[PDB]
Structure 1
Amino acid sequence: AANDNNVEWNGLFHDQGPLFDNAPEPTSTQSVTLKLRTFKGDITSANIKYWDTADNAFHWVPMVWDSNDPTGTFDYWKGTIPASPSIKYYRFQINDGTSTAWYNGNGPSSTEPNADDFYIIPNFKTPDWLKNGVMYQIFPDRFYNGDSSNDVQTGSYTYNGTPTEKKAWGSSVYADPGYDNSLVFFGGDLAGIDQKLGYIKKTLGANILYLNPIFKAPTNHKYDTQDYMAVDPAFGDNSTLQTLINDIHSTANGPKGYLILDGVFNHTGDSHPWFDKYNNFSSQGAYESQSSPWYNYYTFYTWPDSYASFLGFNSLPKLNYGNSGSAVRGVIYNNSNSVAKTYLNPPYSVDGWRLNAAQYVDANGNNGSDVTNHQIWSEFRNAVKGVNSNAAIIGQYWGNANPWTAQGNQWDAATNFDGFTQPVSEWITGKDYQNNSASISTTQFDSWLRGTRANYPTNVQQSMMNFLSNHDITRFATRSGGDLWKTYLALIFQMTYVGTPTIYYGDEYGMQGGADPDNRRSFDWSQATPSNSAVALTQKLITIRNQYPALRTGSFMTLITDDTNKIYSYGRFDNVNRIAVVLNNDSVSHTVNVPVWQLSMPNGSTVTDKITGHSYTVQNGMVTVAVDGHYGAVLAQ
């Protein structure tokens, strides 16, 4: 490069990784020093332009040359944004004579952008254990029956007239005629999870467990809560939970663990005593009497038959949050004995909440995604963080969750359907998570990923729940057509991307399954051993991620987007490690020349592909590696 009236986009780079930001999660008194990379001698001047919410205006900070990288290929320019309590958004203006370029969250641009700027949210912190961990999601009744003395037998009880149906471990999910799918039980329980912690924390290596609803409810999924204060009998009792939590936090059975519970706070089940639609309690529920002490916990359009609910499901009456200080806000999160605080405080001390149907929470029966909804989650964060600043808050949302994350006053992260699950599905399987024809090329995949990461503050990005499948979508293995290699590729990307790798139980060995409830099959324990190819890769990958902090909190830079050979390469790097991930999304092998010079990997140095164990030497800024079809290489140094 040189001073030739031309800014070379390929040499430019910035993100909030260690090499470019000295304060990614600053307090009110900490200044933020940013570094912008360019090819050596490529420009004449650069400036940081930031919008300050404190005065609703732009501010200008000219940058100064700082240093060259070890390879002498790049320049690092720097500038500092002053410390203050206000949220700020920044972008860079880059000039080389008569040539000007702009750069922000969405990368380089010839014209000045007005969106996707980088974020500076003083005092906003997401749990670092979440940024650095690996999560394992378990649907209780389908993981492992550790105690058969609490199994829901056929005809054990009825819900809305229908009797429960038990099935042999491994048998089909769908309920035989005469029963309901929501009332099928296999026997999975807490005791089982406790007994299988070794498989979770050692065989695989995950250190975070996220469980679907475990509180008293008639169904098998239990999103229709009957009693938030009690573990459902089919899963055990509250003592069983305390023991499970102890064994999860214990370091005697593997690395320290964390437990995230599913918080179903937008609605209760219609069988909850506050509502009591079928009169299962001597008390008078809202549905039973307009004089009920909990009558105003719900919203009736036509008492008692027509009321606000989750997506029209009468079995899920919607909770009325009213105004600040309401009784409902109290039992959910404000009260010391609320659902949220009870489990976060001893003797439970869980580590987080996954917020079910979070966008809908509101007052008076409204549908959320409004001012009131956001005020509620703001108060929710204060309540939760007040009890435990290191308790995670992850909201369920299918699209861009920027509205509940980008102001640092609500959630720490969200279910990453739009930024991970969907794009990964369409690129690798040619299907969307619903299993409908939907394919994207490598260049599109990469663009999609950048655009979605840009929707969030960096600490939020690193905390996103990135799963291949989950209880509401079709199994990746099914969308893949039963092809294990596609799962191999998905796992490699998952374990080396930005955000919390989240493994939906069974996905580690390639468990198949269609749409609800076929996506909740029982777990096959004979297939959960390193003797399984996917399981073995999962354990190896988790070990790899755990070894390199760069994979969890390092920078992310695109290296290759080849639509011809279907090759995708990107680097993850920090002050210590430089890793070039090379993914082959084609059905045939390809020899790729990886431009590791972009990550500043010194010529003559070596890199090890941790997937195959093979070693390579960097020559002329390149690493030549032959990657099998639907496989990948993790070249690290």
Structure 2
Amino acid sequence: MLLEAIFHEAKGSYAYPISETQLRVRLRAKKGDVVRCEVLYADRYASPEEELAHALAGKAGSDERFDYFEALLECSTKRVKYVFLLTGPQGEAVYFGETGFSAERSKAGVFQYAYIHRSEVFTTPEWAKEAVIYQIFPERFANGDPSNDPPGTEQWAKDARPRHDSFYGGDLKGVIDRLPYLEELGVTALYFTPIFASPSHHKYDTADYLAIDPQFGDLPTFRRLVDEAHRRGIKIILDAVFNHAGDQFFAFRDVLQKGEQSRYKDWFFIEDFPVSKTSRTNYETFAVQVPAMPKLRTENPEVKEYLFDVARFWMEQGIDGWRLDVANEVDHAFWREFRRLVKSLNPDALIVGEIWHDASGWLMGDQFDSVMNYLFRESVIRFFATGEIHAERFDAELTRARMLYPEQAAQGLWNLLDSHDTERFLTSCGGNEAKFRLAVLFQMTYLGTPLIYYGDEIGMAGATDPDCRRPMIWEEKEQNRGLFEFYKELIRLRHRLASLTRGNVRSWHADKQANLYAFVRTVQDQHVGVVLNNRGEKQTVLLQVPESGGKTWLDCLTGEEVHGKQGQLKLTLRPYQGMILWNGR
């Protein structure tokens, strides 16, 4: 077997604590090479004479190239050393440890997890495990207060096409007013795009961190909002824009005015004085040449103390946590201290970073609780929208992504389809509703936390920003109620079936040919099995279901009852149909 494909490291995603006395460990091997992975382990100081402990590692998944193996170590002493025993299909045995490979245990050496610290156990808020989140881009959700509408507000109609600088009048009073709609949908948290004083429709160039933007409301309206949402089981997440200020931020105005007399010059990244050249800015901005968005020097303890003060302020209004804009471009120390502070004020405050690539380095337990899982979105796109990948690549892409982080992270990754920075997911499906609903079914059943983007639930389309930000369709007639009852129904299932909010995932069937993908959520003895017929025609499948997992299932959407003769389940799906099979437990 291929030793060049064998991997483990006693840290990160490969070895990490689940409590104070148990370590999770993972090994990856060329797909097919190992058939048995066993951990032989002991206290770090055990005498060379005491017997090893055994823990046999099940295969938790496979991608394009690897199999992944997973085991739980029971470490009373909280200090472990161990070695893997791998066995190939012909019964070849090799010992894998820190020192290397060898047929002699001893010669493999031992990886070591020196010590489990209670404070180093990744722990996330419980409500997040089983939440569904709704993203509101306030400027375009609901105009409930016409008197606070910005100048030149265009008209709020069924098919306005917004320009980069448009205003439609959405505000906070409109959220308050639409809360029954939200509660009826079944959402349990709201993700607000930025809502602090800024002169733009997105408000990502902050004028004032400590004020509601006047055309969104005032602080009393916000408090009225937090409570009104809270009494309906809805939390409030706010968008913390800490990477950069807007060009009207007090300190930066100081800087434009006083040049290098400003007490605030080292709060920014000023290339030379006077600060301002437009089409050529002489200061570093978000992205490239974005004069409204000078980068904040978060490494500056003054800059840091100030944003910490912001975070406290809003947290005293009772919000429920943060979404961290361009988070991967502010330093790690900032984020570790931000967590120490945030968790200290509210152990249940959630923290979610806006990073699009491999966020493994902010998801070890000391920074973010979760991220907007744009990876999740990529696989979803290329599988149900564009169809670039078939069912077996999809499975690899899902799994490989699943193994990237500690479980505590993957349990509450924000799995979206689209956002305010993206074309709408119906649009990626070229308007094909049938493919869309399958992507929604998938989303509402897969591991992680579903994020809805205001509007998707009733049919809204659009190309990418600023077209993905149209005014929300509110006229019953103009809305896809069929799709709305669909989200509603899916959301209640998610709430009833613990398995869907808390169970794990294992691939159940994956056939590149039929393009029929299935997976299984399990918590305790509950098995829910989801099947996806992502094909234009109608097909049949024989799913391997052993007698142990139950032999009778109930299809949750239709009520249909299904039966397994002989370790097998025969199933006939309709074009783009999905089934959600509860094993009755």
CA shift digits 1:120-150 (9 cap, x unpaired): 8842211121121000001001111121121
Q: 2-side partners of 1:528 and 1:518: how far apart?
A: 22
User: How far off is 1:81 after superposition?
Assistant: 3.4
Residue 424 in structure 1 maps to residue 400 in structure 2: no
Residue 388 in structure 1 maps to residue 346 in structure 2: yes
Residue 81 in structure 1 maps to residue 74 in structure 2: yes
User: How far off is 1:594 after superposition?
Assistant: 2.4
Q: 2-side partners of 1:127 and 1:90: how far apart?
A: 34
Matches within 5 A, 1:82-231: 82=75, 93-94=86-87, 98-100=91-93, 122-154=120-152, 165-175=153-163, 181-182=164-165, 184-202=166-184, 204-231=185-212
Distance 1:221 1:566, change over 3 A: same
User: How far off is 1:65 after superposition?
Assistant: 8.1
Contact preservation (8 Å) 1:601, 1:621: no
CA shift digits 1:263-311 (9 cap, x unpaired): 10000111222212xxxxxxx3455432223222112102213001101
Q: 1-side partners of 2:322 and 2:480: how far apart?
A: 34
User: How far off is 1:588 after superposition?
Assistant: 1.1
Q: 2-side partners of 1:171 and 1:52: how far apart?
A: 66
Q: 1-side partners of 2:262 and 2:71: how far apart?
A: 64
Q: 1-side partners of 2:554 and 2:16: how far apart?
A: 30
Q: 2-side partners of 1:48 and 1:320: how far apart?
A: 47
SS in 2 for 1:587: coil
TM-score by length of 2: 0.82
Q: 2-side partners of 1:259 and 1:601: how far apart?
A: 39
SS in 1 for 2:259: coil
Q: Which has the higher helix share?
A: 2
Q: 1-side partners of 2:448 and 2:293: how far apart?
A: 32
Q: 1-side partners of 2:35 and 2:358: how far apart?
A: 37
Distance 1:33 1:384, change over 3 A: closer
**Amino acid corresponding to residue 369 of structure 2 in structure 1:** D
Matches within 5 A, 1:279-318: 284-286=254-256, 288-303=258-273, 304-305=275-276, 306-312=282-288, 313-318=290-295
Which position in structure 2 is the counterpart of 1:413? 370
Q: 1-side partners of 2:136 and 2:82: how far apart?
A: 38
Distance 1:620 1:93, change over 3 A: same
RMSD: 3.5
User: How far off is 1:52 after superposition?
Assistant: 11
Q: 2-side partners of 1:608 and 1:226: how far apart?
A: 55
Contact preservation (8 Å) 1:610, 1:636: yes
Matches within 5 A, 1:160-559: 165-175=153-163, 181-182=164-165, 184-202=166-184, 204-250=185-231, 253=232, 256-276=233-253, 284-286=254-256, 288-303=258-273, 304-305=275-276, 306-312=282-288, 313-323=290-300, 326-333=301-308, 338-345=309-316, 348-361=317-330, 373-406=331-364, 408-418=365-375, 420-430=376-386, 439-527=388-476, 532-559=481-508
Q: 2-side partners of 1:564 and 1:246: how far apart?
A: 52
Q: 2-side partners of 1:217 and 1:53: how far apart?
A: 56
SS in 1 for 2:176: helix
User: How far off is 1:424 after superposition?
Assistant: 0.4
Contact preservation (8 Å) 1:581, 1:632: yes
Q: 2-side partners of 1:226 and 1:207: how far apart?
A: 30
**Amino acid corresponding to residue 186 of structure 1 in structure 2:** Y
Which position in structure 2 is the counterpart of 1:13? none
TM-score by length of 1: 0.76
Which position in structure 2 is the counterpart of 1:366? none
Distance 1:290 1:465, change over 3 A: same
SS in 1 for 2:238: strand
Contact preservation (8 Å) 1:396, 1:414: yes
CA shift digits 1:558-603 (9 cap, x unpaired): 11111111100011011131011100110011122222328x4223
SS in 2 for 1:259: strand
User: How far off is 1:481 after superposition?
Assistant: 0.9
CA shift digits 1:177-219 (9 cap, x unpaired): xxxx23x1111111111111121122x1110110100110000
Residue 596 in structure 1 maps to residue 545 in structure 2: yes
Distance 1:124 1:64, change over 3 A: closer
**Amino acid corresponding to residue 621 of structure 1 in structure 2:** G
The one of 566, 573, 576 aligned to 1:620 = 566
Distance 1:537 1:49, change over 3 A: farther
SS in 1 for 2:338: helix
Contact preservation (8 Å) 1:231, 1:238: yes
| Residue identity (%) | 33
Q: 2-side partners of 1:53 and 1:307: how far apart?
A: 53
Contact preservation (8 Å) 1:46, 1:62: no
Which position in structure 1 is the counterpart of 2:63? none
**Amino acid corresponding to residue 294 of structure 1 in structure 2:** Y
Q: 2-side partners of 1:90 and 1:207: how far apart?
A: 44
Q: 2-side partners of 1:558 and 1:83: how far apart?
A: 33
Equivalent residue pairs, number: 525
Distance 1:342 1:519, change over 3 A: same
Distance 1:531 1:520, change over 3 A: closer
Q: 1-side partners of 2:258 and 2:457: how far apart?
A: 47
Q: 1-side partners of 2:79 and 2:443: how far apart?
A: 34
Distance 1:212 1:415, change over 3 A: same
Q: 2-side partners of 1:359 and 1:447: how far apart?
A: 26
